[PDB]
Design an enzyme around this catalytic site. Structure first.
Site, PDB file in Angstrom:
ATOM      1  N   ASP A   6       0.822  -1.191   0.000  1.00 37.17           N
ATOM      2  CA  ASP A   6       0.000   0.000   0.000  1.00 37.17           C
ATOM      3  C   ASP A   6       0.860   1.247   0.000  1.00 37.17           C
ATOM      4  O   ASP A   6       1.919   1.301   0.639  1.00 37.17           O
ATOM      5  CB  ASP A   6      -0.890  -0.031   1.245  1.00 37.17           C
ATOM      6  CG  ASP A   6      -1.907   1.091   1.277  1.00 37.17           C
ATOM      7  OD1 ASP A   6      -2.191   1.690   0.214  1.00 37.17           O
ATOM      8  OD2 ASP A   6      -2.435   1.349   2.381  1.00 37.17           O
ATOM      9  N   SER A   7       0.396   2.254  -0.723  1.00 38.70           N
ATOM     10  CA  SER A   7       1.102   3.518  -0.802  1.00 38.70           C
ATOM     11  C   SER A   7       0.758   4.278   0.471  1.00 38.70           C
ATOM     12  O   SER A   7       1.506   5.133   0.928  1.00 38.70           O
ATOM     13  CB  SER A   7       0.638   4.299  -2.032  1.00 38.70           C
ATOM     14  OG  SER A   7      -0.744   4.600  -1.938  1.00 38.70           O
TER      15      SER A   7
ATOM     16  N   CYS B 222      -3.437  -0.369  -2.372  1.00 41.07           N
ATOM     17  CA  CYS B 222      -3.588   0.967  -2.938  1.00 41.07           C
ATOM     18  C   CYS B 222      -4.201   0.897  -4.348  1.00 41.07           C
ATOM     19  O   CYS B 222      -4.013  -0.091  -5.056  1.00 41.07           O
ATOM     20  CB  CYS B 222      -2.211   1.640  -2.991  1.00 41.07           C
ATOM     21  SG  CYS B 222      -2.088   3.078  -4.092  1.00 41.07           S
TER      22      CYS B 222
ATOM     23  N   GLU C 281     -11.570   6.706  13.513  1.00 44.20           N
ATOM     24  CA  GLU C 281     -12.869   6.275  14.000  1.00 44.20           C
ATOM     25  C   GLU C 281     -13.929   7.253  13.538  1.00 44.20           C
ATOM     26  O   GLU C 281     -14.579   7.907  14.348  1.00 44.20           O
ATOM     27  CB  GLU C 281     -12.867   6.189  15.524  1.00 44.20           C
ATOM     28  CG  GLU C 281     -11.726   5.358  16.082  1.00 44.20           C
ATOM     29  CD  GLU C 281     -11.895   5.047  17.557  1.00 44.20           C
ATOM     30  OE1 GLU C 281     -12.841   4.302  17.897  1.00 44.20           O
ATOM     31  OE2 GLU C 281     -11.082   5.544  18.370  1.00 44.20           O
TER      32      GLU C 281
ATOM     33  N   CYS D 206     -11.447   3.824  -3.224  1.00 47.75           N
ATOM     34  CA  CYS D 206     -10.373   4.142  -2.287  1.00 47.75           C
ATOM     35  C   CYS D 206     -10.509   3.141  -1.153  1.00 47.75           C
ATOM     36  O   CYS D 206     -11.603   2.910  -0.643  1.00 47.75           O
ATOM     37  CB  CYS D 206     -10.492   5.576  -1.746  1.00 47.75           C
ATOM     38  SG  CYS D 206      -9.118   6.076  -0.624  1.00 47.75           S
TER      39      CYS D 206
ATOM     40  N   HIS E 224      -9.854   3.232   2.044  1.00 51.08           N
ATOM     41  CA  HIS E 224     -10.386   3.638   3.344  1.00 51.08           C
ATOM     42  C   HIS E 224     -11.830   4.160   3.297  1.00 51.08           C
ATOM     43  O   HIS E 224     -12.434   4.442   4.335  1.00 51.08           O
ATOM     44  CB  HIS E 224      -9.452   4.648   4.049  1.00 51.08           C
ATOM     45  CG  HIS E 224      -9.188   5.899   3.277  1.00 51.08           C
ATOM     46  ND1 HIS E 224     -10.148   6.867   3.070  1.00 51.08           N
ATOM     47  CD2 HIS E 224      -8.063   6.349   2.672  1.00 51.08           C
ATOM     48  CE1 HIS E 224      -9.627   7.861   2.371  1.00 51.08           C
ATOM     49  NE2 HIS E 224      -8.363   7.572   2.117  1.00 51.08           N
TER      50      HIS E 224
END
Lengths: 268, 254
Positions: B10-11, B64, B143, B173, B175
């Protein structure tokens, strides 16, 4: 295959299926329903069925002929729909070919492993498949501690090719009722009896259709290997071959595929 | 049984969500995780791949999305182990999940700029319509759920307004899945959301079987390794919260 009014080339080759009979056609049906855009080449070697009791040597020899016939048909992938062919030469065929080689037994086994709750798996199939005990072997090769109970249902195949049917299923599965949490449909003919089987096992047992699981693998593998066809291109140029009794083959095929399919009789 | 770990590169750190998905669906598999012009991102990625290979991984997953767009196909063609990214599986799921063929996709300016999602979707299914939005305001929140939902809704909508009213939305994405409930709300109930990372983990399963490299099913992997080239302190805090367990990270200098 250049996409019409488009800029990229997409694979146009068909997916091959080998079997020692007509049962594999149900895996073919699952393919058509899930991937309507993929061409099919099916070779059924009924002329030398049943493979089951024959020596490994002959089985390897027959399987390879089926493989080569599929290759001459320019297939981009080969699916083993015959349990015995899979048990005996699937491993060596897959290691030697430059195209993906899949079987139905493996994804059924894996889905059983991932779906069991308490570790009690059931397998119903033909006396032969149950006799080879191949499902239990594949399942336990990956997760040796899974309990596998295998039961032959000799009246199942005939019923596939009614209230009597209902009774037969109920009595055939009885020894399994209440003793497992997962059940593998270990015969390609059984997906046609699923609703009744679900009824006999109750809502406490999850049914695993090996053919469907296999078709799911096909979808991911075609993409992984970049040999997927144009999703919008409906496919119809489906080829069906048999080495014996094309009459009944067309009978059963036309019926399951719900369309008059044309069978070509061949000599290997 | 192949006890080797599955590698994740992951970047950033958003890829940690794919790892979580892995833990949930494949509790038995060990994990090794590590997390501008093209040529530079390409080289940086190779260094990440080189690291994973020294960790003896049996598979490499690109978490990523920009790394996948930049070097996934190059690395995959050059390695002897399976390699996959999250884009293709997300792409494939959207195509199967689309009703009217109206698909949308949100992600990082870099990701959208590459247009990798529409490209892969149309590569598999050429007639599918794809609308790609930009959301540089969506940065990794640990969170986000602890923030007043009505605050998050305003902020989310503020970026997803143009897209409001597509039948499928791809979360381009890693996240973004942490903001799912809001995204789902802002986008209404007739929009099926596609979680690329989750679809990827489903593919992982197929390929571990295909290459016959499944780990031991009768045990819970507990020897995962998390690395970072940056602030190890902030990283552990982020990872410990997302994985719901105090994980220990190790800073490395590439």
């Amino acid at each position: 295959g250049l996409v019409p009014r488009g800029s990229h080339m997409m694979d146009t080759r068909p997916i091959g299926f080998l079997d020692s009979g007509v049962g594999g056609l149900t895996v073919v049906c699952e393919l058509i329903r899930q991937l309507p855009h993929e061409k099919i080449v099916y070779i059924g070697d009924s002329a030398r069925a049943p493979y089951g009791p024959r020596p490994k040597k002959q089985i390897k020899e027959y399987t390879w002929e089926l493989v080569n016939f599929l290759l001459t048909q320019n297939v981009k992938m080969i699916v083993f729909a015959c349990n015995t062919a899979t048990a005996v030469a699937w491993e060596e065929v897959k290691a030697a070919l430059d195209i993906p080689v899949l079987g139905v037994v493996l994804p059924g086994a894996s889905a059983a492993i991932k779906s069991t709750t308490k570790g009690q798996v059931g397998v119903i199939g033909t006396p032969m498949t149950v006799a080879s005990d191949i499902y239990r072997k594949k399942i336990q090769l990956l997760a040796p501690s899974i309990q596998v109970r295998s039961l032959a249902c000799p009246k199942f195949v005939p019923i596939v090719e009614s209230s009597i049917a209902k009774k037969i299923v109920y009595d055939s599965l009885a020894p399994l009722v209440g003793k497992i949490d997962t059940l593998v449909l270990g015969c390609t003919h059984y997906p046609l009896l699923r609703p009744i089987i679900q009824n006999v096992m109750g809502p406490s047992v999850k049914l695993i259709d090996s053919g469907a699981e296999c078709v799911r693998d096909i979808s991911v593998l075609l993409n992984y290997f970049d040999i997927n066809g144009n999703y919008h291109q409906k496919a119809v140029e489906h080829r069906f071959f048999t080495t014996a009794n094309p009459e009944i083959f067309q009978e059963i095929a036309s019926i399951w595929l719900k369309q008059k399919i044309n069978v070509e009789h061949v000599t290997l």
